[PDB]
Amino acid sequence: EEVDHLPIYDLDPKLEEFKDHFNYRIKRYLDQKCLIEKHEGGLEEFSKGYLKFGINTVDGATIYREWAPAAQEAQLIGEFNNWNGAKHKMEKDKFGIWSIKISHVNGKPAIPHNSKVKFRFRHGGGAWVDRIPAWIRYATFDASKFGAPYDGVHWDPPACERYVFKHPRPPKPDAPRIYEAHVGMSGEEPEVSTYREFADNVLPRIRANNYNTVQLMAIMEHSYYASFGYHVTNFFAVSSRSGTPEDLKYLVDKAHSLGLRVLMDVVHSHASNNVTDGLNGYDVGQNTHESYFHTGDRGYHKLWDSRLFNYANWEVLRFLLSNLRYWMDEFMFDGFRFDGVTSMLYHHHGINKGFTGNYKEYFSLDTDVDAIVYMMLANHLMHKLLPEATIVAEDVSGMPVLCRPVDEGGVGFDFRLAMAIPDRWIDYLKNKEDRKWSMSEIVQTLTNRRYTEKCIAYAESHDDKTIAFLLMDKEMYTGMSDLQPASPTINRGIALQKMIHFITMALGGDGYLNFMGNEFGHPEWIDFPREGNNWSYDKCRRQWSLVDTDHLRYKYMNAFDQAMNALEEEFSFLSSSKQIVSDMNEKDKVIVFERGDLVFVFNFHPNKTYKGYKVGCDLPGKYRVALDSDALVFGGHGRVGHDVDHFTSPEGMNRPNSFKVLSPPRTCVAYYRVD
């Protein structure tokens, strides 16, 4: 009844044209939520699946449950029964759920902590098929033959071997300033670094640079390291190559001790096609109703060579929804990024598309209502468990109401990534001479967004040449030493890196993201150990020594990043709806804008200094430098006086006031009004 007028219609009048689609979508959501409440005691109860599935201790007994309707026989095997499951046969209920209850022996659990287990089943009268339980919380590999392969590990450490959280979740910041990181490649050494090494060495740097949030990639277990965490095998398992689940808790608690929020990459967009180690091992040709995945084309993602979930399946909803609670409750995360949302939103998965902005592309028979219902239930659940959670969507398409609350009719995400921004910088840096850069085009890319929804801006992210390397290339290996004066190319590259980051932050959105190393213009690119590079770890690491060495110039880019984040912390401009681009000067290559209380002046001209350049502002009074890219501490030339007063003159009777500034070439300066 109330689904006749969704709040989203008042927010965007164009949406009402697609009332039929939203009618269908919202009713599907309501129906599914009602089913969950009727049969499973609500979303909060339904998402406690990990206390029911996998291996769990109960009074005097151990219970193991596994959903496998396609099997006719099933047993639990492991080191505990010498890999013979004859005395540990499971029984199958009418819903295709297999169970076994194993009595304690002298009050001791039958399956020792840190011991290997497998789900053993037979289908169609064939040989035993042995898989890792779908709800396993840890899975290890032996670096001798295969890889790998992986072993499911019962993780239930005794009291003195458990990590106990000491610190509370910090509060939700006014704007997320996000440091995106991958633990494995976070060390200096050409090796897989560990959770504890990241916590102890990298977390302090993140805090020192004034980030308030960590986006932690590659946590969900993945057998293929080069997948960057995207191709998940064991959804409930902390990736073992960097340590144990207790090591991850240590990392999260340490982040919290430093006042940092932690979000985890949630990959619910697909599953690895790895048959031996992952969920795909449960597909034995059965109907989709009896699988994690669709069948035929709908079951396969061509681009990711991966399997695609049937989001309408009861057990798939239990699995995924419980997975969210698992990470949130057990590991104390402050939220998540859902990766591959674009693929989830459409049956074509947005592959090599192509989105025009026409609403017909968003609301049609290509819209995946199954997946949207799941994400709606997910967002309703997560924000109920943790009201201050931040949930980010990775969506390139620009789907309307993706980031409006479920109660409005939206999908329920808090932020989307501003995924169009990095493409603009790449094209400009690779293909366009500095003199042909359009100031309006830069502004368009940064500002052409949905203003009823929040976004996280970033100049570059993982996936290859960095902005700094596009700017400076081979010259970085010699030119970054302060032992000789900077060349014109080094001076240009350092200047523009700061400017590109700063305009992206200030104009691009309502939050900011930076990938590990890019804050100081880390050289080269990221390359994981693959077959095509002969399993090299050379570019699968971070050269912290570059930023730690005082006789290098990376410190200059790092200092600016620190100051930029500190500036946001002081003035709160990311969380301000006041955004006015007052000057786009194509001839002079100048952009002037206001964000919140700050007036920003960007001079992209290669060589020209503008004395007494008139810039518009809102409030009259006395202005001074708030942040100056040309300061010597940021490796600039020190041409802009920080103690210089800039008095305003009245305008009118398109800004009401103005002052005059000095603007040297390739500089960005933010000015504030003196109280």
XYZ file of C-alpha atoms in Angstrom:
675
model
C 0.000 0.000 0.000
C 2.658 2.519 1.114
C 4.769 1.251 -1.820
C 2.638 3.534 -4.049
C 4.697 6.606 -3.117
C 8.280 5.778 -2.191
C 10.295 8.662 -0.666
C 12.809 8.271 -3.545
C 10.174 9.714 -5.917
C 10.236 13.059 -4.056
C 14.023 13.060 -4.285
C 14.165 12.399 -8.028
C 10.977 13.036 -10.076
C 12.305 11.087 -13.099
C 12.010 7.841 -11.095
C 8.190 7.776 -11.103
C 8.297 6.899 -14.814
C 9.603 3.489 -13.725
C 6.921 2.916 -11.077
C 6.230 -0.543 -12.557
C 9.824 -1.645 -12.014
C 9.988 -0.232 -8.474
C 6.585 -1.760 -7.673
C 8.015 -5.158 -8.645
C 11.333 -4.556 -6.866
C 10.009 -3.274 -3.526
C 7.289 -5.947 -3.358
C 9.964 -8.613 -4.034
C 11.980 -7.131 -1.143
C 8.944 -6.978 1.172
C 7.889 -10.536 0.272
C 11.395 -11.921 0.838
C 11.739 -10.074 4.164
C 8.316 -11.420 5.233
C 9.380 -14.984 4.357
C 12.548 -14.583 6.447
C 10.529 -13.206 9.392
C 7.908 -15.980 9.092
C 10.267 -18.956 8.732
C 13.542 -17.827 10.336
C 12.620 -15.297 13.041
C 13.830 -12.219 11.148
C 17.002 -10.977 9.457
C 18.999 -10.668 12.686
C 18.255 -14.307 13.583
C 18.631 -15.605 9.995
C 22.117 -14.028 9.748
C 23.358 -16.105 12.727
C 23.812 -19.004 10.277
C 27.454 -19.588 11.212
C 26.329 -20.805 14.657
C 24.279 -23.475 12.849
C 26.372 -24.332 9.785
C 29.984 -25.497 9.750
C 31.441 -26.899 12.976
C 30.034 -25.650 16.289
C 30.435 -26.739 19.908
C 27.212 -27.370 21.845
C 26.638 -28.855 25.327
C 28.689 -32.067 25.561
C 28.807 -32.350 21.766
C 30.090 -30.974 18.471
C 27.609 -30.293 15.682
C 28.572 -30.088 12.020
C 26.076 -29.019 9.323
C 26.485 -28.677 5.554
C 23.914 -27.879 2.866
C 24.370 -30.320 -0.036
C 20.973 -31.489 -1.451
C 22.621 -33.095 -4.516
C 24.460 -35.678 -2.359
C 22.972 -39.066 -1.369
C 25.667 -39.927 1.180
C 27.869 -37.651 3.264
C 30.468 -37.945 6.013
C 32.818 -35.713 7.977
C 36.495 -36.640 7.480
C 39.682 -35.188 8.948
C 42.869 -35.767 10.919
C 40.541 -36.518 13.864
C 39.260 -39.740 12.215
C 42.365 -40.556 10.115
C 40.490 -39.318 7.006
C 37.967 -42.168 7.310
C 34.374 -40.995 7.835
C 32.689 -44.396 8.301
C 31.917 -43.645 11.971
C 31.071 -40.016 11.221
C 28.210 -40.449 8.761
C 25.861 -37.513 8.312
C 22.069 -37.514 7.972
C 20.153 -35.455 5.413
C 16.997 -33.534 6.383
C 14.144 -32.718 3.975
C 15.745 -29.382 3.036
C 18.975 -31.094 1.907
C 20.933 -30.014 5.001
C 23.367 -32.653 6.284
C 23.998 -32.897 10.024
C 26.039 -34.817 12.580
C 26.306 -34.583 16.359
C 29.586 -35.827 17.825
C 29.771 -36.512 21.568
C 32.675 -35.077 23.567
C 35.238 -37.556 24.917
C 35.928 -36.793 28.603
C 34.477 -33.288 28.140
C 36.894 -32.631 25.278
C 35.652 -31.758 21.739
C 36.098 -34.580 19.212
C 37.729 -32.298 16.613
C 40.953 -30.693 17.883
C 41.464 -26.988 17.244
C 43.806 -26.288 14.300
C 43.206 -29.679 12.669
C 42.208 -30.408 9.071
C 38.726 -31.468 7.947
C 36.734 -32.106 4.749
C 33.126 -32.689 3.707
C 33.042 -36.100 2.018
C 30.079 -36.862 -0.227
C 28.885 -39.136 -2.990
C 26.662 -38.115 -5.903
C 25.117 -40.398 -8.556
C 26.839 -43.484 -7.121
C 30.350 -42.312 -8.035
C 33.578 -42.034 -6.044
C 33.799 -39.989 -2.849
C 34.080 -36.244 -3.526
C 36.021 -34.360 -0.814
C 35.495 -30.624 -0.331
C 36.299 -27.882 2.163
C 33.191 -27.088 4.253
C 31.482 -23.956 2.888
C 31.407 -22.333 6.336
C 35.040 -23.079 7.244
C 36.730 -20.239 9.152
C 40.316 -21.039 8.171
C 41.981 -22.836 5.262
C 45.711 -23.459 4.856
C 48.039 -24.603 2.081
C 51.329 -26.511 1.959
C 53.903 -24.880 -0.339
C 54.838 -28.327 -1.726
C 53.197 -29.561 -4.978
C 49.949 -28.100 -6.423
C 50.055 -24.917 -4.324
C 48.183 -25.809 -2.212
C 45.829 -27.588 -2.522
C 43.952 -26.133 0.418
C 42.908 -27.892 3.605
C 39.853 -26.834 5.602
C 40.913 -26.156 9.179
C 38.712 -26.313 12.254
C 39.437 -23.014 13.985
C 38.433 -22.984 17.652
C 41.457 -21.782 19.671
C 41.570 -22.385 23.448
C 41.248 -19.309 25.698
C 44.960 -18.404 25.895
C 45.273 -18.589 22.078
C 42.289 -16.353 21.258
C 42.727 -12.662 20.535
C 40.473 -10.556 22.764
C 39.396 -7.123 21.503
C 40.478 -4.385 23.923
C 39.300 -1.239 22.149
C 35.893 0.140 21.134
C 34.838 0.971 17.594
C 35.632 4.656 16.999
C 32.753 6.968 16.011
C 31.697 7.518 12.402
C 33.721 10.445 11.010
C 31.969 13.393 9.335
C 33.629 12.247 6.101
C 35.483 9.026 5.328
C 39.138 9.610 4.470
C 40.076 6.119 3.311
C 43.452 4.421 3.105
C 42.993 1.382 0.877
C 45.393 -1.450 1.604
C 46.350 -5.046 0.841
C 48.202 -6.847 3.658
C 50.219 -9.320 1.543
C 51.880 -6.620 -0.563
C 52.233 -4.067 2.277
C 55.805 -4.961 3.294
C 59.092 -3.738 1.812
C 60.287 -7.319 1.193
C 59.349 -9.227 -2.010
C 57.179 -11.642 -0.007
C 53.670 -12.058 1.410
C 53.600 -9.756 4.427
C 51.576 -10.577 7.539
C 48.578 -9.087 9.392
C 50.732 -8.304 12.438
C 53.469 -6.667 10.330
C 50.791 -4.491 8.669
C 49.247 -3.600 12.044
C 52.595 -2.693 13.603
C 54.280 -0.966 10.662
C 51.653 0.386 8.267
C 48.738 1.389 10.544
C 50.795 4.119 12.303
C 51.658 5.678 8.900
C 47.977 5.701 7.958
C 47.177 7.555 11.191
C 50.172 9.904 10.762
C 48.849 10.927 7.312
C 45.486 11.825 8.936
C 43.339 9.142 7.297
C 40.385 8.128 9.472
C 39.447 4.862 7.729
C 41.211 1.751 6.397
C 39.732 -0.164 3.463
C 41.132 -3.655 3.906
C 41.216 -5.710 0.712
C 41.766 -9.451 0.197
C 40.583 -10.715 3.589
C 38.139 -13.381 2.362
C 40.229 -16.423 1.436
C 41.340 -16.731 -2.189
C 43.623 -19.474 -3.555
C 44.878 -17.297 -6.417
C 47.007 -14.530 -4.872
C 47.125 -12.543 -8.146
C 43.307 -12.155 -7.970
C 43.944 -9.265 -5.525
C 41.338 -10.940 -3.254
C 38.543 -10.722 -5.826
C 38.127 -14.451 -6.584
C 36.977 -15.883 -3.269
C 37.181 -19.582 -2.435
C 36.328 -19.711 1.298
C 33.934 -16.905 2.243
C 34.132 -17.328 6.034
C 37.925 -17.758 6.127
C 40.605 -15.165 6.879
C 43.225 -15.488 4.118
C 45.865 -17.723 5.698
C 48.925 -16.533 3.752
C 49.221 -13.470 6.016
C 48.334 -15.210 9.302
C 45.466 -16.565 11.397
C 42.026 -15.076 12.207
C 43.505 -14.000 15.579
C 46.206 -12.029 13.738
C 43.460 -10.180 11.831
C 41.614 -9.353 15.067
C 44.896 -7.926 16.375
C 45.087 -5.732 13.240
C 41.498 -4.455 13.601
C 41.909 -3.814 17.338
C 45.191 -1.910 16.718
C 43.521 0.198 14.025
C 40.742 0.945 16.520
C 43.324 1.830 19.206
C 44.612 4.517 16.801
C 41.124 5.942 16.199
C 40.786 4.419 12.710
C 37.649 2.784 11.332
C 38.158 -0.451 9.361
C 36.087 -1.587 6.388
C 36.563 -4.944 4.671
C 36.195 -5.829 1.002
C 33.076 -7.977 0.703
C 33.053 -9.942 -2.562
C 29.489 -11.229 -2.911
C 29.404 -10.498 -6.641
C 30.777 -13.922 -7.629
C 32.778 -16.942 -6.451
C 36.029 -18.508 -7.636
C 35.591 -21.336 -10.147
C 38.209 -23.349 -8.212
C 36.689 -26.830 -7.872
C 38.994 -28.317 -5.206
C 39.339 -25.412 -2.741
C 36.165 -23.346 -3.188
C 32.357 -23.325 -3.367
C 32.402 -24.414 -7.002
C 33.337 -27.831 -5.621
C 29.676 -28.210 -4.611
C 28.390 -27.983 -8.198
C 27.960 -31.534 -9.513
C 25.483 -30.648 -12.281
C 22.359 -30.240 -10.127
C 19.482 -27.773 -10.698
C 20.135 -24.161 -9.622
C 17.604 -24.553 -6.769
C 20.047 -27.066 -5.259
C 23.201 -25.016 -5.959
C 24.923 -21.849 -4.701
C 24.947 -20.773 -8.312
C 22.809 -20.336 -11.391
C 23.299 -22.785 -14.268
C 24.055 -22.118 -17.952
C 25.148 -18.618 -18.989
C 23.569 -16.997 -15.915
C 25.834 -19.148 -13.744
C 29.041 -17.960 -15.426
C 30.843 -14.603 -15.500
C 32.897 -14.610 -18.741
C 35.208 -11.763 -17.733
C 36.074 -13.022 -14.224
C 35.996 -16.712 -15.273
C 33.884 -17.184 -12.165
C 30.568 -18.532 -10.869
C 27.521 -16.382 -10.160
C 25.222 -16.816 -7.138
C 21.500 -17.486 -7.301
C 20.443 -14.711 -4.894
C 16.871 -16.066 -4.724
C 17.955 -19.344 -3.080
C 17.081 -19.597 0.633
C 20.447 -21.091 1.583
C 22.362 -18.537 -0.521
C 20.606 -15.733 1.393
C 21.447 -17.450 4.698
C 25.084 -17.910 3.624
C 25.668 -14.343 2.371
C 23.636 -12.562 5.070
C 25.353 -14.613 7.797
C 28.705 -13.854 6.168
C 28.051 -10.124 6.708
C 27.223 -10.613 10.395
C 30.224 -12.947 10.741
C 32.729 -10.286 9.626
C 30.972 -7.516 11.545
C 30.449 -9.307 14.880
C 33.494 -11.590 15.029
C 36.108 -9.206 13.595
C 34.712 -5.845 14.723
C 34.584 -4.178 11.303
C 32.976 -0.737 11.001
C 31.539 -1.558 7.571
C 32.356 -2.945 4.151
C 32.848 -2.248 0.488
C 30.734 -4.481 -1.723
C 32.965 -5.205 -4.709
C 31.537 -5.749 -8.196
C 28.144 -4.133 -7.536
C 27.850 -3.225 -11.241
C 27.982 -6.954 -12.114
C 25.323 -7.636 -9.471
C 22.946 -4.912 -10.702
C 22.499 -6.147 -14.294
C 22.152 -9.506 -16.074
C 24.721 -8.283 -18.626
C 26.975 -7.349 -15.647
C 27.921 -4.040 -17.335
C 30.646 -5.964 -19.186
C 32.230 -3.583 -21.740
C 29.395 -1.095 -21.220
C 28.799 1.759 -21.955
C 26.383 3.560 -19.583
C 24.784 6.735 -20.990
C 22.819 7.920 -17.930
C 19.455 7.152 -19.547
C 17.180 5.666 -16.860
C 15.978 3.018 -19.340
C 19.399 1.383 -18.888
C 18.908 1.339 -15.111
C 15.293 0.127 -14.872
C 14.547 -2.641 -17.359
C 14.440 -6.428 -17.817
C 18.251 -6.333 -17.527
C 17.965 -5.121 -13.924
C 18.816 -7.955 -11.529
C 16.075 -7.686 -8.897
C 17.282 -10.901 -7.181
C 20.658 -9.288 -6.399
C 19.086 -5.936 -5.497
C 16.727 -7.622 -3.019
C 19.773 -9.299 -1.445
C 21.676 -5.991 -1.184
C 18.572 -4.311 0.312
C 18.200 -7.037 2.943
C 21.962 -6.801 3.501
C 21.903 -3.033 4.047
C 18.813 -3.220 6.265
C 20.517 -5.909 8.356
C 23.921 -4.219 8.629
C 22.633 -0.764 9.608
C 20.413 -2.459 12.214
C 23.387 -4.309 13.751
C 25.579 -1.220 13.562
C 23.688 2.085 12.943
C 26.964 3.914 12.264
C 28.273 1.335 9.766
C 29.553 2.657 6.432
C 28.737 0.444 3.434
C 30.353 1.419 0.115
C 29.302 0.199 -3.339
C 31.733 -0.364 -6.194
C 29.444 0.601 -9.107
C 30.659 2.157 -12.400
C 27.146 2.500 -13.848
C 25.809 5.379 -11.711
C 22.652 3.477 -10.674
C 20.116 5.923 -9.158
C 19.110 5.348 -5.495
C 21.928 2.829 -5.011
C 22.933 5.061 -2.103
C 19.539 5.948 -0.638
C 18.222 4.108 2.462
C 16.113 0.951 2.136
C 13.228 2.690 3.974
C 13.107 5.244 1.128
C 13.004 2.553 -1.550
C 16.761 2.699 -2.170
C 19.354 -0.094 -2.200
C 20.774 1.125 1.123
C 24.453 1.875 0.446
C 26.059 4.866 2.200
C 28.607 5.784 -0.490
C 29.537 4.840 -4.023
C 33.039 5.104 -5.459
C 33.571 7.948 -7.950
C 34.920 5.502 -10.525
C 34.931 7.941 -13.482
C 37.559 10.260 -11.964
C 40.694 8.113 -12.469
C 39.877 7.587 -16.178
C 39.941 11.367 -16.758
C 43.429 11.698 -15.224
C 44.736 8.679 -17.154
C 43.552 10.039 -20.525
C 44.870 13.524 -19.766
C 48.282 12.349 -18.549
C 48.769 9.767 -21.322
C 47.157 11.462 -24.305
C 46.852 15.231 -23.891
C 49.556 17.900 -23.885
C 49.329 20.194 -20.838
C 48.249 23.134 -23.036
C 45.236 21.182 -24.329
C 43.883 20.295 -20.867
C 40.374 21.698 -20.468
C 39.552 23.238 -17.090
C 35.797 22.795 -17.639
C 36.268 19.123 -18.583
C 38.193 18.504 -15.332
C 35.395 20.240 -13.405
C 32.712 18.236 -15.261
C 34.318 14.896 -14.355
C 34.667 15.882 -10.697
C 31.250 17.556 -10.306
C 28.901 15.692 -12.657
C 27.441 13.342 -10.048
C 24.185 12.627 -8.198
C 23.944 15.233 -5.415
C 21.219 13.363 -3.513
C 23.733 10.545 -2.953
C 27.229 10.473 -1.429
C 30.420 9.446 -3.174
C 34.068 8.683 -2.400
C 36.560 10.367 -4.704
C 40.032 9.150 -5.624
C 42.540 10.228 -8.262
C 43.879 6.701 -8.709
C 43.375 3.247 -7.224
C 44.804 -0.236 -7.721
C 44.604 -1.548 -11.316
C 48.667 0.063 -13.892
C 51.162 2.993 -14.004
C 50.677 5.415 -11.103
C 49.920 9.128 -11.574
C 53.472 9.916 -10.404
C 54.903 7.417 -12.906
C 52.714 8.733 -15.742
C 54.080 12.170 -14.780
C 57.763 11.343 -14.364
C 58.408 7.810 -15.720
C 62.031 6.542 -15.797
C 63.324 9.841 -14.386
C 62.070 8.859 -10.889
C 64.908 6.356 -10.343
C 67.533 9.151 -10.401
C 65.634 12.456 -10.223
C 64.015 11.841 -6.840
C 67.349 12.172 -5.018
C 67.602 15.599 -3.359
C 71.398 15.423 -3.834
C 70.974 17.239 -7.154
C 68.499 20.063 -7.870
C 65.182 18.832 -9.275
C 64.936 18.707 -13.053
C 62.017 20.425 -14.855
C 60.316 17.003 -15.211
C 60.634 16.165 -11.496
C 59.396 19.649 -10.527
C 56.418 19.278 -12.879
C 55.554 15.759 -11.664
C 55.706 16.593 -7.952
C 53.618 19.760 -8.479
C 50.918 18.047 -10.546
C 50.657 14.970 -8.295
C 49.744 17.212 -5.350
C 47.325 19.223 -7.518
C 45.593 16.182 -9.021
C 45.096 14.611 -5.578
C 43.891 17.898 -4.026
C 41.330 18.902 -6.674
C 40.017 15.316 -6.764
C 39.511 15.392 -2.993
C 38.041 18.903 -2.702
C 35.740 18.819 -5.756
C 35.173 15.108 -6.343
C 32.948 14.008 -3.494
C 31.884 13.542 0.084
C 34.798 11.285 1.038
C 38.308 10.444 -0.158
C 40.251 7.292 -1.025
C 43.983 6.682 -1.418
C 45.654 3.352 -2.246
C 48.725 2.372 -0.213
C 51.870 4.042 -1.563
C 50.126 6.581 -3.789
C 50.149 9.195 -1.011
C 53.891 9.698 -1.625
C 53.898 9.036 -5.376
C 55.233 5.474 -5.117
C 56.892 4.696 -8.495
C 56.260 1.966 -11.085
C 53.101 -0.159 -10.764
C 51.567 -3.174 -9.009
C 52.173 -6.657 -10.416
C 51.336 -9.866 -8.546
C 53.185 -13.182 -8.982
C 51.590 -14.599 -12.146
C 52.516 -17.209 -14.757
C 53.042 -14.392 -17.287
C 55.764 -12.762 -15.181
C 57.342 -16.004 -13.890
C 55.878 -15.643 -10.361
C 57.763 -12.431 -9.511
C 57.317 -10.598 -6.179
C 59.271 -7.517 -7.321
C 56.257 -5.247 -7.847
C 54.164 -7.026 -5.209
C 55.380 -4.960 -2.242
C 55.695 -1.364 -0.997
C 58.992 0.543 -0.968
C 58.559 2.369 2.339
C 62.297 3.101 2.231
C 61.509 5.690 -0.479
C 59.412 7.797 1.886
C 61.566 7.072 4.946
C 64.760 8.386 3.252
C 65.328 12.115 3.896
C 67.632 12.532 0.893
C 64.722 11.598 -1.389
C 61.823 13.754 -2.626
C 58.958 11.315 -1.933
C 58.716 12.879 1.533
C 57.478 16.071 -0.171
C 54.471 14.346 -1.718
C 53.851 12.521 1.569
C 53.923 15.759 3.607
C 51.384 17.397 1.309
C 49.051 14.386 1.621
C 49.313 14.563 5.404
C 48.540 18.317 5.294
C 45.661 17.869 2.836
C 43.985 15.334 5.137
C 44.686 17.569 8.155
C 43.078 20.483 6.254
C 39.952 18.387 5.695
C 39.946 17.424 9.386
C 40.072 21.130 10.428
C 37.583 22.589 7.926
C 35.287 19.614 7.183
C 34.895 20.555 3.495
C 34.075 16.979 2.324
C 30.859 16.981 4.388
C 29.797 20.400 3.075
C 27.035 20.859 0.479
C 28.452 24.312 -0.322
C 30.260 23.812 -3.617
C 30.613 26.631 -6.124
C 32.920 26.580 -9.141
C 33.366 30.302 -9.789
C 36.163 30.378 -12.390
C 37.094 28.041 -15.238
C 39.697 30.036 -17.131
C 40.722 28.052 -20.217
C 43.315 30.497 -21.561
C 45.085 30.980 -18.215
C 44.507 27.357 -17.069
C 42.998 28.406 -13.736
C 40.230 26.798 -11.691
C 38.758 28.605 -8.701
C 36.095 27.102 -6.441
C 34.626 27.202 -2.956
C 34.068 24.045 -0.932
C 32.654 24.693 2.521
C 34.474 27.623 4.096
C 37.531 27.375 1.845
C 38.383 29.136 -1.423
C 40.607 27.038 -3.704
C 42.899 28.334 -6.445
C 44.390 25.896 -8.952
C 46.856 27.112 -11.581
C 47.478 24.374 -14.156
C 49.515 26.648 -16.448
C 53.046 25.308 -17.117
C 54.975 28.577 -16.618
C 52.822 31.666 -15.949
C 52.555 33.444 -12.596
C 49.383 35.464 -12.012
C 49.826 38.458 -9.710
C 46.680 40.049 -8.277
C 44.404 37.341 -9.687
C 40.818 38.088 -8.659
C 38.999 35.216 -6.944
C 35.351 35.240 -5.814
C 34.261 34.405 -2.263
C 31.115 34.340 -0.126
C 31.885 36.035 3.215
C 33.679 39.413 3.403
C 36.736 39.976 5.604
C 40.366 38.919 5.802
C 41.740 35.835 4.020
C 45.012 33.963 4.486
C 46.625 30.742 3.243
C 45.153 27.548 4.728
C 47.154 25.125 2.545
C 49.818 26.009 -0.025
C 51.256 23.376 -2.420
C 54.185 25.699 -3.175
C 55.493 25.661 0.422
C 59.110 24.494 0.695
C 58.005 21.662 3.039
C 56.025 20.245 0.088
C 59.044 20.645 -2.227
C 57.733 23.879 -3.780
C 59.506 27.185 -4.437
C 58.053 29.172 -1.513
C 56.565 31.922 -3.688
C 53.296 32.240 -1.720
C 53.418 34.162 1.579
C 51.452 32.463 4.356
C 51.365 35.562 6.579
C 49.976 37.760 3.778
C 46.521 39.232 4.425
C 44.036 39.157 1.536
C 41.295 41.726 2.153
C 37.981 41.412 0.319
C 36.247 43.924 -1.952
C 32.433 43.979 -2.391
C 30.730 42.711 -5.572
C 27.239 43.356 -6.998
C 24.497 45.402 -5.314
C 28.940 35.499 -9.748
C 30.106 35.783 -6.120
C 29.169 38.568 -3.638
C 32.792 39.329 -2.656
C 36.331 38.959 -4.017
C 39.994 39.108 -3.034
C 43.276 39.051 -4.961
C 45.968 36.356 -4.828
C 49.379 35.440 -6.189
C 49.137 32.240 -8.243
C 52.428 30.704 -9.461
C 52.326 28.040 -12.228
C 51.353 24.476 -11.243
C 50.229 25.375 -7.729
C 47.104 24.931 -5.666
C 46.344 27.115 -2.675
C 43.411 26.992 -0.276
C 42.447 30.197 1.543
C 40.429 30.621 4.744
C 38.626 33.570 6.361
C 40.293 34.877 9.544
C 37.886 34.815 12.504
